[PDB]
Structures are given as structure tokens and as C-alpha cells.
């Protein structure tokens, strides 16, 4: 029963509105030249195609472009030849989509695209999320206890050297943040970098988005039509599962930093 | 804090839930995909047969350019106007709110190596702050709801049933009131403004409030004229719905804790 007074919450609300306004202005400044280059590229490509081929007509070209856009919304890949029997909605991939929907990540790479699918998605999401929340809390507690006990043992071994009451806590917090961060985020980013054509920055951005639960869908593991291992979606989902508890703890630590900045 | 065995049992239950959901989704959704796959292949073959001059390699090059454009974030369906852009202040404000809220619609993404870094930094600092806002509003609403429950708690009138029946009825009434105010009335507003299917409107509202954020339907995705404050009002409704639902869930969680303590 925290019961923060109305003035405090409206202060936080004003802060949040300022935060979005600053974010919107910076994002507009960054995006506008890249968008301009994009707009020029597409206009130039359309003009070049029309000039190159007499047969093509603006109406027919627009119709083909519209059909391709509908295909992208549909989820079918227009490029080259799609395989009807394999490489789409594999038991692993559908499992991964179910894991994201319950996890709330929601990549958007694959969607129901049917009335029954949409109704199933709403019912399945509402039933699935409380269970996954309970599981996340339980896994977080178990991981926290095991990790803490391990730190306890390592510290107790190293407690005698350089004893300080400030340093013991600063070392414990820094050790937990870095040790968890390297395995949970740094190692998957490198593995993603090697397995797929994505650059290191893109891979790190992908890991931050999934662990953070934003799930933009700009980068999705397994999305590219390339050869994959037999069980790639389950291992990635399991990594997301273990990673989320630690990232939630990190979010709590940043929240604590914010509150302290409060006084 | 629960036993390790309980975590394994819940993990097994969630995995079985995921497998049954994945199988149902796969069976439910392969016919639509097949019809789509046939439609795209027929459209491409029809285009090739219709025009002799256009070769398959050129068609593939165009398809690759269009898919890159969709990934880039610029629609190719119609000739664009440089003055009007996707990264407008209202839309950028909506995207920033989406980032802090972890909805992650994904229609608009940084698509730049500086923008992506700013996105990770912005999301990490913003999200705990949004969490504190959500918790503060949730607890204030919980306090008003508790006072209202106490007000209706007295039952000296005719047909006063058990307290358990009363609490269940109050919870059901509150959930129905929230569902009507946020799940259904905005869905009708969205249906009116964007001409979406009646099922699609609730699907979008559930996804947005739930925070899964597939990106299939976005308030500002369609390129049609909109009110100047459409994106800010939509984000304001998202915040109000999330906060109210968070308050209701917190009240149920506290009551659940009490129930567990009892008997
Ligand atoms: C309890 C009544 C709900 C009945 C639902 C009937 C209509 C369906 C509308 C779906 C609304 C879902 O509303 C509920 O809101 C809470 C808000 O914390 C969401 O909770 C989510 O919030 C945060 C965002 O800050 C996420 O990072 C997190 O993954 C998750 O906990 C739930 O995912 C969702 O279950
Ligand atoms: K989320
Ligand atoms: K999300
Ligand atoms: K998302």
C-alpha cells in the first residue's frame, strides 16, 4: 500500500510527458535524413524502371507493388520461389510464436491472418500470460537464490583480502550485473552475429529488444530463409526465458537508481 | 519464493500449453497460407506471361527492392509527398511512448546505427520510470476502488448474500466496466476511423493493452488523413487502459494472496 499522493503521481506524469517529447524531437532529427534518402531511392528506382522498359505501365506497376505489399502483410515471402511443403510454420517456429505471444514480446514476423486465429490469439494470450508471469517470478527467485549462493561462496573465499564494507557491496553488485550481462546478452549477440548476416550492433539491438520485451520485429532470429539447426527455436526461447528474469532484476536496479535520484 | 520442484512442474505445464497451442495454430492456419501462396505465385506467373520484355531476374530485383523498402519503413504503394512523412512529431511521440510501454508495434524502427543505440539507452532509462508511473496510478485507483468496495460492503437491505458472493460480483462488475470502457468503445472508434473488421478492432485493442504489440494493425499505419492529436489521444488511452487494468490485476493479486493465506 504505497499510496503515493496525487501530487507525486502527476509529477511523474509530467516527467514522462517531457521524456516522450524529448524522445520524439531527437528521433525526428535522426530519422528525417535517412527517410529522405529512402524516399529519393524509391522514387529513383521507380523512374529508372519505367524509363528502362516501355512495356511496363504505371497502373500495372502499382498493382504489382500493392500485391507484394499485401504479401508482406500476409507473411509469405515474395522473393524467389516459396516452398509450400517446408520452411514455413514448422513445429519449432509455431512453438516460438506461441512463446513470444505468451512472453508478450510479440515480434510480428508471423501473424494469425485468420478470424479463428485472431480469436485463438486473444483467448490464448489472456490465459497464457498469468501462467508465464508466475513461471517468470518462480524462475527469477530460483535463479536469484542460486546466483546469490554462488556469489556468497566466491566472496567468502575472497572476503579476507582487501576487506571493506563499501567495496564488498560494490563488488557484489558489479559482479552480478557484469557476470549475468556477458552470458545472457554478450554471448548471444556474438552467436547471432556468426549464425546470421547481422552486424554486431544489430545483434546487440536485437537482444536488448527481446529481453526488454519491446519485440519490434525488425530483427527476428530464424526469420531469414537460411539453413538452420534442428532445434533452434526452442533453445532461443529457453535463452529468452532465463534471460528475462535477470533483465527484470536489472530493470529493478535501474528503478532503484531512479528513486534514489529522487531525493 | 517457491520450491524448485514447483518451478519444474509449472515449466512442464507451460511447455505442454505451448505445444498444444502451436499444434492448434498450425492446423488452423495452413489453408489460408496455401491460398495466399497460390495467389502470389499465380500473380507473378500472370505478370510474366502478360509482359514478354520483363524477365524473371528483373522481377526478382524489383521484389527485393520493394521488400527492402518495407523493411526500411517507406510504403511503395503510392507516390509519396516529401512534406508528409512517417516520422512525424505525433507519430514519433507515439513510437517513443510505445518504446517506453514495451508495446513494440515495429512499423517504425530506428533503421540507423545511431538511432538504434539511442533506442537501447532510451528504453533502458525510460521503462523503469514508466513502471513507476503505472504502479503509482494503479495504486491510487486501487485505493479509490477499495473505498468504493467498503462503501458497498454494508448490506442491511433485503437479500444480502454472503461476502464471497458480493466480492465476486463486484470484481465481475469492475472487470466488465473496464472491458466495455477500454476493450470495446475504443474498438468501435477504431472501426469507424479506419474501417477495420469488427473482430480486428478488438484484436488490436487486446494486443495494444496486453502489450504484445504484433504490429499487424497500427493506429497510424494506414496512409489516410488523421486528426492532429489522434496519436497523442490514442497513447493517452493506452496509458489509461494499462494503468486501470494494472490496478485491477494488483487488487486481484492481493486478494489472491489473502485467499492463499486463508484455509
Ligand atoms: C484482468 C481483466 C482482464 C480481462 C481481459 C478481457 C479483455 C482483453 C483485454 C486484454 C488486456 C490485458 O491487460 C493486462 O495489462 C497488464 C498491464 O500491466 C499487462 O501486463 C504487462 O504490462 C507490462 C507493460 O508495462 C509488460 O512489460 C509485462 O509483460 C506485462 O506484465 C498484461 O499483459 C495484460 O494482461
Ligand atoms: K511487453
Ligand atoms: K511487445
Ligand atoms: K511487440
Author numbering:
A (entry chain A): 39 to 301
B (entry chain B): 41 to 303
From the paper:
Tandem pore domain (K2P) potassium channels modulate resting membrane potentials and shape cellular excitability. For the mechanosensitive subfamily of K2Ps (including the TREK1, TREK2, and TRAAK channels), diverse stimuli control channel activity, including lipids, pH, heat, membrane tension, post-translational modification, and an array of pharmacologically active agents including volatile anesthetics, antidepressants, and neuroprotective agents. Two key regions of the mechanosensitive K2P channel structure appear to control channel function, the conformationally flexible TM4 helix, and the selectivity filter. Overall, this cryo-EM structure exhibits K2P architectural features consistent with prior crystallographic studies: a dimeric channel assembly with each subunit composed of four transmembrane helices, a domain-swapped cap located above the selectivity filter, and an extended membrane facing TM2/TM3 loop within each subunit.
Using single particle cryo-EM, we first solved a 3.27 Å resolution structure of TREK1 solubilized in DDM detergent in an unexpected conformation. However, unlike all prior TREK1 structures, where intermolecular crystallization contacts immobilize the TM4 helix in an “up” conformation, the TM4s in our cryo-EM samples are unconstrained prior to sample vitrification. As a result, we find that TREK1 exhibits a previously unobserved asymmetric TM4 “up/down” conformational state. This asymmetry is due to an ~11° bend in the TM4a helix in the “up” state relative to the TM4b helix in the “down” state. The apparent cause of the observed TREK1 TM4 asymmetry is the presence of a density non-contiguous with the TREK1 density map but near the TM4b helix, sterically impeding TM4b from adopting the “up” conformation (pink). This density extends directly below the TREK1 selectivity filter, occluding the ion permeation pathway. The TREK1 protein is solubilized in n-dodecyl-β-d-maltoside (DDM) detergent and a molecule of DDM easily fits the observed density if the DDM is oriented with its maltoside sugar moieties located within the pore and hydrocarbon tail projecting outward toward the fenestration. While the positioning of this pore-bound DDM molecule is inverted relative to the orientation of DDM molecules in the micelle surrounding the TREK1 protein, the presence of a detergent molecule within the TREK1 pore suggested that this site could be a target for lipids in a biological membrane. Native MS analyses of DDM-purified TREK1 showed intact TREK1 dimer with a charge distribution similar to results previously observed for TRAAK in DM detergent, but did not identify any lipids bound to the TREK1 protein. While prior structures of TRAAK channels also exhibited asymmetric positioning of the TM4 helices, this asymmetry has always been attributed to crystallization artifacts and has not been considered biologically relevant.
